[PDB]
Amino acid sequence: LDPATLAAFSAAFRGELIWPSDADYDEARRIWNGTIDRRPALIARCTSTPDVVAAVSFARKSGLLVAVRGGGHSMAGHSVCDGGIVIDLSLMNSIKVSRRLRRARAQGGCLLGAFDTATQAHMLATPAGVVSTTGLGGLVLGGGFGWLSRKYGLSIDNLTSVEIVTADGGVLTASDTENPDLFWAVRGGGGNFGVVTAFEFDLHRVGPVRFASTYYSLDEGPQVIRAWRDHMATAPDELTWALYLRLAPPLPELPADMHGKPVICAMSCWIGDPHEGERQLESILHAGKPHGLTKATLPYRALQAYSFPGAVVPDRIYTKSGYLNELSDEATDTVLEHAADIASPFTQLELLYLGGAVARVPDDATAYPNRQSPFVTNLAAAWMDPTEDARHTAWAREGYRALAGHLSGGYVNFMNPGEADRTREAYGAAKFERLQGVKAKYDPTNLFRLNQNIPPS
Amino acid sequence: LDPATLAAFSAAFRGELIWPSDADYDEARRIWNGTIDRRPALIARCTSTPDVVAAVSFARKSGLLVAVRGGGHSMAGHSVCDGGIVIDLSLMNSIKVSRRLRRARAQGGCLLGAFDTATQAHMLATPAGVVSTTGLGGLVLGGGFGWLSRKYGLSIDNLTSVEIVTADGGVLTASDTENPDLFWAVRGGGGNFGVVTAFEFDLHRVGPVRFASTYYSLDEGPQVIRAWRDHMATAPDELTWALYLRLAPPLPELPADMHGKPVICAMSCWIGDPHEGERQLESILHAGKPHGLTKATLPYRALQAYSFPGAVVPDRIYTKSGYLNELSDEATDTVLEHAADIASPFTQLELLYLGGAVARVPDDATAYPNRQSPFVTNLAAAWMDPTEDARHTAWAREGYRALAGHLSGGYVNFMNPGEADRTREAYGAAKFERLQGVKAKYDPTNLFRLNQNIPPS
Numbered sequence: 001l002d003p004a005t006l007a008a009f010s011a012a013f014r015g016e017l018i019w020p021s022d023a024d025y026d027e028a029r030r031i032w033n034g035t036i037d038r039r040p041a042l043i044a045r046c047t048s049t050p051d052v053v054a055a056v057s058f059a060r061k062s063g064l065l066v067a068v069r070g071g072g073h074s075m076a077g078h079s080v081c082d083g084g085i086v087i088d089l090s091l092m093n094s095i096k097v098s099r100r101l102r103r104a105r106a107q108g109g110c111l112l113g114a115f116d117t118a119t120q121a122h123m124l125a126t127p128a129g130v131v132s133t134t135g136l137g138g139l140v141l142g143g144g145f146g147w148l149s150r151k152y153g154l155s156i157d158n159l160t161s162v163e164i165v166t167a168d169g170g171v172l173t174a175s176d177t178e179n180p181d182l183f184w185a186v187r188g189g190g191g192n193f194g195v196v197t198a199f200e201f202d203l204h205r206v207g208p209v210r211f212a213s214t215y216y217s218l219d220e221g222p223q224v225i226r227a228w229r230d231h232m233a234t235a236p237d238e239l240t241w242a243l244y245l246r247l248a249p250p251l252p253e254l255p256a257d258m259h260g261k262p263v264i265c266a267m268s269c270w271i272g273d274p275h276e277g278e279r280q281l282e283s284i285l286h287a288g289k290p291h292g293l294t295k296a297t298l299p300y301r302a303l304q305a306y307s308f309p310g311a312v313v314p315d316r317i318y319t320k321s322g323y324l325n326e327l328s329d330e331a332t333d334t335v336l337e338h339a340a341d342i343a344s345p346f347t348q349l350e351l352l353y354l355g356g357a358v359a360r361v362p363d364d365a366t367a368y369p370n371r372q373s374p375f376v377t378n379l380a381a382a383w384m385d386p387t388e389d390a391r392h393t394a395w396a397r398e399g400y401r402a403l404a405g406h407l408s409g410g411y412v413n414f415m416n417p418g419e420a421d422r423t424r425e426a427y428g429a430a431k432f433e434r435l436q437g438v439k440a441k442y443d444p445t446n447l448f449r450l451n452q453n454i455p456p457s
Numbered sequence: 458l459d460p461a462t463l464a465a466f467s468a469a470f471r472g473e474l475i476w477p478s479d480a481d482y483d484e485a486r487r488i489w490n491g492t493i494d495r496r497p498a499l500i501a502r503c504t505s506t507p508d509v510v511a512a513v514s515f516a517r518k519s520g521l522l523v524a525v526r527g528g529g530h531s532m533a534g535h536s537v538c539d540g541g542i543v544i545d546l547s548l549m550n551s552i553k554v555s556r557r558l559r560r561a562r563a564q565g566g567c568l569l570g571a572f573d574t575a576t577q578a579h580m581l582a583t584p585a586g587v588v589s590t591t592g593l594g595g596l597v598l599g600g601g602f603g604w605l606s607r608k609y610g611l612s613i614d615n616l617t618s619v620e621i622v623t624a625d626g627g628v629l630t631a632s633d634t635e636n637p638d639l640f641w642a643v644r645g646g647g648g649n650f651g652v653v654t655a656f657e658f659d660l661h662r663v664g665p666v667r668f669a670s671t672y673y674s675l676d677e678g679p680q681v682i683r684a685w686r687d688h689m690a691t692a693p694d695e696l697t698w699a700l701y702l703r704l705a706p707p708l709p710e711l712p713a714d715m716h717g718k719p720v721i722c723a724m725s726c727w728i729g730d731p732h733e734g735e736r737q738l739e740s741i742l743h744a745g746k747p748h749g750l751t752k753a754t755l756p757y758r759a760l761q762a763y764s765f766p767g768a769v770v771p772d773r774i775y776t777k778s779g780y781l782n783e784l785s786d787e788a789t790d791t792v793l794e795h796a797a798d799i800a801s802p803f804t805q806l807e808l809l810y811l812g813g814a815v816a817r818v819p820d821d822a823t824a825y826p827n828r829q830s831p832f833v834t835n836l837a838a839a840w841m842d843p844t845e846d847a848r849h850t851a852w853a854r855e856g857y858r859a860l861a862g863h864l865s866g867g868y869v870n871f872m873n874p875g876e877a878d879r880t881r882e883a884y885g886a887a888k889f890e891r892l893q894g895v896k897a898k899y900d901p902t903n904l905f906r907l908n909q910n911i912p913p914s
């Protein structure tokens with residue numbers, strides 16, 4: 001690099017720089033998806049909005065490929081690059097909560113767990129994903145859903161404004177009253193339009209929630225899934241009920257006989273009065289014979305911390321995901337036969353139901369696509385051994401292929417590293433080309449292209 | 458203030474200053490103990506170690522009373538002052554966790570829930586308190602105990618070094634090899650010796666833990682508490698079992714007749730193989746009939762997020778606590794009789810058992826006193842109404858007074874605002890006077906006096 005520019009950048013940067021020669025480089029460059037092994041020229045750990053301005057201008061002037069990293073959970077591996085700069089936000093994880101306002105301001109590098117901790121100090125909360133180690137940054141920019149979404153919508157449905165650094169180094173506010181074209185785009189358009197350094201959210205009061213997790217044999221697979229899809233079609237918003245097909249974990253609540261064998265793990269909660277929730281959950285817990293039933297009344301922060309129970313975190317991941325408008329009987333049996341071939345104990349075939357509040361938002365209100373498709377399926381292969389990559393990748397691909405016509409769209413936040421060309425299909429032509437128009441205005445050179453990328457014009 | 462001193466301060470300060478005229482003054486100055494209503498001259502929200510150096514030097518030159526704020530959980534209200542400066546660390550909450558080193562470097566404003574999130578990304582953990590909103594900063598400086606402590610010790614038993622800003626504005630490292638007198642003092646000596654801007658910890662791998670919570674009627678109060686005190690005397694380190702006497706929360710797992718009436722809430726976990734945990738917990742669950750039994754195998758981060766059942770944040774608190782060397786039958790009847798008079802649904806009479814790894818550290822190895830007393834009781838009055846302060850406070854004082862002589866020492870982190878004169882008894886003469894000698898060296902002017910204070914010399 002040009003020393004003057006490198007020196008210039010350094011003069012303006014108060015964070016920590018990690019070079020390939022430094023000691024925390026190999027670990028700083030690893031992301032959650034360990035199949036992605038890349039070596040940046042530079043890792044810039046920003047500590048403030050001025051730091052990110054300096055890093056973005058440096059990358060622009062040097063012509064370095066820009067990776068932005070929040071929590072490192074990209075299933076496509078977008079948060080690390082070969083030979084470019086990582087704009088790493090993981091040290092910007094402060095959150096200010098006003099109890100009086102029911103508002104949270106969170107930095108771009110926050111983890112969900114920290115966010116939930118800070119808001120639950122006041123018994124407040126807003127929708128986010130179910131794994132607490134996930135970064136707020138990439139989750140919100142792609143939409144973000146979890147236990148609270150059927151009641152309160154997507155994370156973007158509770159976003160009130162952002163502070164964002166654009167590719168030319170300027171700091172902008174985006175809200176419904178300031179740069180509203182940009183505010184439209186960041187609500188579902190990913191990292192395409194700049195580095196969000198602050199997210200502001202509306203918060204809701206969420207007290208203890210009745211929660212249940214249990215396991216069904218695949219022998220009862222057809223009636224469980226059918227009961228689930230039938231019930232969710234008319235369920236109240238307060239009910240969330242998700243199915244995860246997987247090998248049974250060797251946990252004491254399940255008989256040793258079931259351990260390591262394909263099962264349906266069913267998790268459900270009631271967002272509302274726990275007494276009503278006890279009644280609602282028990283009415284849906286017995287479509288199959290429930291094994292290893294755990295029922296609890298949990299602080300919301302404890303529900304957020306629950307997924308998923310297990311001795312390790314898988315090192316290698318490959319996901320194939322899409323939406324469904326209906327889950328047909330043919331589609332049910334296909335999921336069940338593919339679940340029966342699960343090989344790794346970390347792999348999950350996820351069946352999620354959204355709808356509710358998410359569905360109620362007008363389709364063009366944000367850049368998030370496919371609100372009106374209630375089902376999400378995610379074949380989430382996960383494993384350890386690098387020499388078994390092909391078998392696990394193959395399980396997720398062929399499951400996806402067997403379902404293909406039932407599936408439409410795609411959640412940008414579940415895309416794998418080979419799915420760069422799924423961007424148009426995911427958004428649809430209308431949203432895609434409106435996003436292209438916002439990109440030509442705020443990122444005309446496509447400085448931000450490590451994402452489900454939207455080329456300008 | 459003197460405008461050239463202030464102008465120098467603000468020039469060196471990259472954080473936020475909050476003045477009494479500022480919007481968010483009133484909220485920034487509130488702490489968790491809402492009986493403490495104080496108005497600082499200035500709240501300085503630090504964002505880095507250089508910020509803390511600037512604020513500390515500004516306070517010293519200005520002669521402002523210094524309050525240090527981490528998580529705001531001071532039961533004595535030490536984290537806000539009338540007329541001084543709050544050096545507020547709550548925006549410094551970044552955590553670096555290295556999976557290879559099993560190390561966590563945590564800034565001095567971290568909350569436990571953020572720390573546990575960050576370490577559990579690698580299935581790692583280290584002992585801390587049981588409520589995730591507590592500040593790491595004040596908790597560790599007093600010792601720190603929770604679910605992992607009988608197995609792995611106090612938080613200070615896993616602290617390997619700190620970065621600390623002393624009253625003269627210098628930044629020091631303290632460890633077993635650098636400034637070891639100071640390193641002894643900060644491990645149990647509170648905020649007396651400076652502002653800790655970073656804590657480094659050893660981490661341990663902690664996977665799923667078998668957990669149980671249940672409630673006993675006070676009718677069976679005597680046999681439950683006797684079984685508890687008899688069993689813990691010889692329990693393995695892996696078992697933690699705590700009792701919380703309280704009004705039963707109106708939760709669906711409990712019969713409506715028990716709602717709002719005094720009960721023993723018993724929580725236990727096994728830090729180890731969940732199948733062995735299931736065996737161990739069931740052997741201790743049946744000294745009385747368990748009502749509202751919840752059993753679960755939880756990620757450790759979810760165990761940390763669990764406390765407490767009901768999840769309501771009380772506005773007003775008053776605590777009386779001490780250690781016990783033995784729990785006699787007469788002390789047991791006293792605890793049961795006072796619990797029967799609990800008036801507020803947020804109030805708890807806590808019965809904890811430490812021992813284990815805490816008790817195997819030599820007594821003089823740190824400044825934390827009374828490792829050899831295994832029992833802790835905490836009469837924690839908590840309520841909403843400011844016009845009823847006297848009743849709630851009276852319940853706590855009277856309970857403590859009833860216990861009398863069974864109680865010795867006292868955990869500095871459970872002191873109330875009227876307990877400044879308990880510092881000597883809490884530490885004991887030998888530790889107190891050694892701490893004074895460390896105080897004479899590192900804080901001779903007693904600039905840091907909002908704490909269980911140790912005067913120099």
Ligand SMILES: Cc1cc2nc3c(=O)[nH]c(=O)nc-3n(C[C@H](O)[C@H](O)[C@H](O)COP(=O)(O)OP(=O)(O)OC[C@H]3O[C@@H](n4cnc5c(N)ncnc54)[C@H](O)[C@@H]3O)c2cc1C
Nearest residue numbers: 070071072073074079108129130135137138139145191196
């Ligand atoms: C185990 C696991 C569980 C999950 N659970 C769910 C869930 O329940 N619900 C759900 O909706 N999703 C979930 N996700 C997906 C998650 O939403 C996406 O992986 C998301 O992009 C991760 O965000 P991140 O900041 O952690 O990842 P990163 O790898 O850091 O970044 C992902 C993308 O966001 C961009 N980006 C990140 N931060 C910023 C920022 N501040 N400004 C601009 N761009 C940014 C990056 O450039 C990249 O394109 C899960 C993922 C994993 C791995």
Ligand SMILES: Cc1cc2nc3c(=O)[nH]c(=O)nc-3n(C[C@H](O)[C@H](O)[C@H](O)COP(=O)(O)OP(=O)(O)OC[C@H]3O[C@@H](n4cnc5c(N)ncnc54)[C@H](O)[C@@H]3O)c2cc1C
Nearest residue numbers: 527528529530531536565586587592594595596602648653
């Ligand atoms: C609801 C609740 C549950 C609790 N649970 C437990 C538990 O399970 N186990 C346990 O051991 N304790 C527990 N505690 C007590 C806790 O350890 C003390 O309240 C502790 O002082 C909290 O630290 P803090 O930073 O949050 O509070 P603060 O009010 O911000 O600070 C308390 C003291 O520490 C000083 N201080 C704080 N941070 C720093 C720093 N970085 N450098 C120098 N000084 C600092 C302050 O000056 C003050 O004297 C609990 C408290 C509450 C209120």
